[PDB]
Amino acid sequence: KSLKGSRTEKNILTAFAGESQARNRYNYFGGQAKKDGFVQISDIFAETADQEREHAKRLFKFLEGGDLEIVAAFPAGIIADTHANLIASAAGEHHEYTEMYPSFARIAREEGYEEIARVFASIAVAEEFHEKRFLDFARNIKEGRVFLREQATKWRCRNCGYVHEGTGAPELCPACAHPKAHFELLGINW
Amino acid sequence: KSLKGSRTEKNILTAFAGESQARNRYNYFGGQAKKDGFVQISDIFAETADQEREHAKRLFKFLEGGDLEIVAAFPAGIIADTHANLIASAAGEHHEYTEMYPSFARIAREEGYEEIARVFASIAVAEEFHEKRFLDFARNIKEGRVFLREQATKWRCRNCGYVHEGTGAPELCPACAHPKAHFELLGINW
Ligand SMILES: [Fe+2]
Numbered sequence: 001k002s003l004k005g006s007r008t009e010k011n012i013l014t015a016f017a018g019e020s021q022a023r024n025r026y027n028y029f030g031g032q033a034k035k036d037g038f039v040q041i042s043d044i045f046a047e048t049a050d051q052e053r054e055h056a057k058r059l060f061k062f063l064e065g066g067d068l069e070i071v072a073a074f075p076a077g078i079i080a081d082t083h084a085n086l087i088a089s090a091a092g093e094h095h096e097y098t099e100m101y102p103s104f105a106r107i108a109r110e111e112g113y114e115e116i117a118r119v120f121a122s123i124a125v126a127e128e129f130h131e132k133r134f135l136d137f138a139r140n141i142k143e144g145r146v147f148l149r150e151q152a153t154k155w156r157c158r159n160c161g162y163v164h165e166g167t168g169a170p171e172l173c174p175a176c177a178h179p180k181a182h183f184e185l186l187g188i189n190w
Numbered sequence: 191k192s193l194k195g196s197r198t199e200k201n202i203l204t205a206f207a208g209e210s211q212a213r214n215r216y217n218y219f220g221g222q223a224k225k226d227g228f229v230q231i232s233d234i235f236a237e238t239a240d241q242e243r244e245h246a247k248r249l250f251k252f253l254e255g256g257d258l259e260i261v262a263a264f265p266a267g268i269i270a271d272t273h274a275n276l277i278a279s280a281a282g283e284h285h286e287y288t289e290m291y292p293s294f295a296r297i298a299r300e301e302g303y304e305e306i307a308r309v310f311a312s313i314a315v316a317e318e319f320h321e322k323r324f325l326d327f328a329r330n331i332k333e334g335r336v337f338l339r340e341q342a343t344k345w346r347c348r349n350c351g352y353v354h355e356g357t358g359a360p361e362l363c364p365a366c367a368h369p370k371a372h373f374e375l376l377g378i379n380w
């Protein structure tokens with residue numbers, strides 16, 4: 001049925017507004033992460049921003065047109081160091097998957113919008129993993145484990161693919177000469 | 191010392207030529223992988239192409255100028271199905287890390303170009319992992335394990351970040367509605 005006049009219609013636009021701002025914030029944090037010498041984290045922020053773009057698109061497509069007024073609170077700033085940005089981002093993700101989306105989903109189910117409710121619940125799953133990544137990286141930074149680990153392991157240069165074996169990433173990639181900032185733990189998800 | 195007239199100078203340009211063609215081939219294969227419904231593989235081809243761009247840049251920067259003639263054989267085509275493209279790509283990587291770069295490195299050391307020799311040896315390491323990825327993905331396709339596994343595991347939608355738990359990726363992402371093609375095994379390399 002139509003969304004016109006329902007609380008769900010307002011909630012969808014509210015979610016769209018938040019998703020849109022998150023995309024921008026994450027891209028800015030990605031830029032800051034690059035400046036702070038954290039390439040993997042920078043690319044993660046960029047990827048997360050792209051995924052928020054997709055959450056927003058799905059939501060946007062449910063709308064039926066017209067200008068709708070919404071009342072909502074958003075983070076007024078700010079861009080800080082990468083650790084701080086990761087913490088702030090995780091906090092935003094947390095509110096989304098623990099409070100906002102579950103609430104929007106429940107209201108959607110109550111008003112009879114089952115498909116939309118399932119979408120809100122599904123997006124919440126994505127946001128929870130987004131938070132996990134942000135918290136994990138913040139922890140790595142705080143503990144000084146981004147480029148150094150207890151036992152020897154494999155590190156991959158994101159710039160050229162060079163693989164280094166050791167307790168920590170090298171100061172300079174021996175293949176492409178790019179700085180340590182480009183290294184990440186070698187991952188194999190296949 | 192100067193590279194002018196050395197065999198290493200020729201080898202560097204030869205490597206640059208091959209690296210350059212590999213970049214194009216991989217980008218084309220990436221496009222084909224997208225058409226075949228393999229998003230993770232498509233992005234891997236694109237990333238690999240970007241890394242070949244960097245191998246080429248490091249090599250290019252060693253050169254001292256002028257037009258140099260080279261004699262070398264290259265793959266004349268072709269673009270086929272993704273499995274075939276992965277196999278062909280792996281074969282190219284194999285020649286590079288088992289024959290070409292080790293030979294270029296040895297000649298470089300013999301002519302007194304230690305830094306360049308180390309770069310050739312280092313690039314070879316990158317190419318070996320490139321091959322591993324290509325062979326692994328080709329095997330997944332051949333065995334029908336790209337989107338389905340024996341035991342239940344976690345699958346991530348590359349488009350929106352949704353996480354699905356089960357033996358296989360869903361036909362449609364419940365969050366962004368994109369097809370199964372966008373799913374990959376959830377990876378955590380940090
Ligand atoms: Fe989102």
Ligand SMILES: [Fe+2]
Nearest residue numbers: 093126127130
């Ligand atoms: Fe998110």
Ligand SMILES: [Fe+2]
Nearest residue numbers: 157160173176
């Ligand atoms: Fe590198």
Ligand SMILES: [Fe+2]
Nearest residue numbers: 209242245317
């Ligand atoms: Fe290469």
Ligand SMILES: [Fe+2]
Nearest residue numbers: 283316317320
């Ligand atoms: Fe390669």
Ligand SMILES: [Fe+2]
Nearest residue numbers: 347350363366
């Ligand atoms: Fe999705």
